[PDB]
């Protein structure tokens, strides 16, 4: 109807705002999510207000819309209407955080979706603020761990361990370790935090640059025979196997 003026929201969904004040002096709001109809009233007339619905299984759904129309917070509560099951915050910049909640209001799992679609999945979370972590990139997945301080994703190949750290502030750094004792074969590397590049050397000689981009990609570029200059062009890693082959 044209009694309501409708407006698209973070995610892909349009909330209709009653063009006029309802019979009780407020603005009535209706939205459509998971084939449900959600309704609420607000003092605001831009689409900012709380809506509710109930599901067929007597889940309570609640859609808090930010004043700025830049963020939706979608909550699933069980029958009581208090005990929270899940919460998704979605920004207009295509970013997100989804959490599944446990009894005692504890987060059991958490998914950060970046603007670009890449994701950080935290699972098996414990009291110490620790647990399992996974990074879903374009083409492949990295697996590792997290603490309260940092997430570490790890790629192993022979005696080599490559660790990609993401600080709580979001800062990326990378380390290479190799238990190999022989100079001729030991993989070693230095991290340039200014250029986000890990340069691998073997027996004093630079072999390759792995660049960890702000677009959450990893590229590889080989050095010449004597390791004096980079050769050819950087190449994107499409698959995990490629990372492993870079550690061989």
């Amino acid at each position, epitope marked *: 109807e044209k009694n309501s003026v409708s407006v698209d929201l973070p995610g892909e969904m349009k909330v209709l705002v009653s063009k006029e004040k309802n019979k009780d002096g407020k603005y009535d709001l209706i939205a459509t999510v998971d084939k449900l109809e959600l309704k609420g009233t607000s003092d605001k007339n831009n689409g900012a207000g709380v809506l509710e619905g109930v599901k067929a299984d007597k889940s309570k759904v609640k859609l808090t819309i930010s004043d700025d129309l830049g963020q939706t917070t979608l909550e699933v509560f069980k029958e009581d209407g208090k005990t929270l099951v899940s919460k998704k915050v979605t920004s207009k910049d295509k970013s997100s955080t989804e959490e599944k909640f446990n009894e005692k209001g504890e987060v059991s799992e958490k998914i950060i979706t970046r603007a670009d679609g890449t994701r950080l999945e935290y699972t098996g979370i414990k009291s110490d603020g620790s647990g399992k972590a996974k990074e879903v990139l374009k083409g492949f997945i990295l697996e590792g761990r997290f603490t309260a301080e940092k997430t570490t994703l790890v790629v192993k190949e022979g005696t080599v361990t490559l660790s990609k750290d993401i600080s709580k502030s979001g800062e990326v750094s990378v380390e290479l370790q190799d238990t*190999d*004792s*022989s*100079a*001729a074969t*030991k993989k*070693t590397a*230095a991290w340039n935090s200014g250029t986000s590049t890990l340069t691998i*050397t073997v*027996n*004093s*000689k630079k072999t390759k640059d792995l660049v960890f981009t702000k677009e959450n990609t990893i590229t590889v570029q080989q050095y*010449d*025979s*004597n*390791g*004096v200059k980079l050769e050819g062009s950087a190449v994107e890693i499409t698959k995990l196997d490629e990372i492993k082959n870079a550690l061989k």
Partner: antibody
Amino acid sequence: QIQLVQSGPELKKPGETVKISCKASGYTFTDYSMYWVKQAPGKGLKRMGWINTETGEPTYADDFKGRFALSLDTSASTAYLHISNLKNEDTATYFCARGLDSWGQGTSVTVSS
Amino acid sequence: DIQMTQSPSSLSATLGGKVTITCKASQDINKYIAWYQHKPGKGPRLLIHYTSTLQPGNPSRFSGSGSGRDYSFSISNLEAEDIAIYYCLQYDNLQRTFGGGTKVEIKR
């Protein structure tokens, strides 16, 4: 195994030239730059230069311009050090080295009348 | 070229002891230090690389530690056959440079 084997001891007079060889075996010669290092009593080890085994391009330390040249026979996996206008200061042991793990045995040069 | 300041220049120690040599770089060298033993009439011999890796063919009495600009190397349980000049080498740069050496003598 991997070996670097250098040419035998030399005695030269001032103003003469000497050419010291370093023969590499057990690896692909072009995979590693060759370093030359000077050892005189009263000094330790000082890098004289290095050469890119693939391109042949030498890079010289500041103190070793003018009289010193690095060259290659890549097919024979042999690197050469040349010194012209020999002076008393060139009396030293000279070593070739590749990577961190390979050294020649040294070449003793005595310049004297 | 990076300056590598090696200390001390000379060491005298009793059999069975731990001697330590330091090497201070003029900038961060990213753990790219190696340590060589040099005995009369031979090529230097690699003992330690990448700060703390022991090269095969050598006893684990030889060790190394450090990061950034500051590095150390130790011989534990010093033996009579450890007499040698020892050198640090930085290889962070193509223009590799050496410490000035440490002559290790036995006190008896």
